[PDB]
Amino acid sequence: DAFVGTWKLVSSENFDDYMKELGVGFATRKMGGMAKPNCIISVNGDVITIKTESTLKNTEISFILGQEFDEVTADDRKVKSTITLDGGVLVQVQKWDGKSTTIKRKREDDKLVVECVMKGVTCTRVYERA
């Protein structure tokens, strides 16, 4: 849709702090910090696929809106994830061990803007079309 395409990370703010608040150890935060992933979003029928591709780590999720799914995150958390569409924003929550984090994906001008929240920490990542 508005989201479909191949997107390249161009800017990131507060990602290390976000990873820290998730309990991500130094080695994984080092891998993630200066990573510049591609994000490849596609849809077929009910099913949306979001692939994240980077030199040291790839991940992928496929989901139906509103339907919880199991996810292994890039930092090896086993989480229960639900993604919904709310006012044009893809809202993802991950729940594990009585905690939650939210990842919101929205389109703004030429940007795919990804807001990641854990407790008091807010990180913002911006992608543009590859």
Ligand SMILES: Cc1sc(NC(=O)C2=C(C(=O)O)CCCC2)c(-c2nc(C3CC3)no2)c1C
């Ligand atoms: C090479 C890469 S990329 C990447 N994470 C992203 O790109 C992420 C997002 C996005 O921009 O889609 C949005 C949500 C957070 C993550 C990691 C990594 N995340 C984590 C914890 C924070 C989940 N630990 O490592 C690494 C090692």
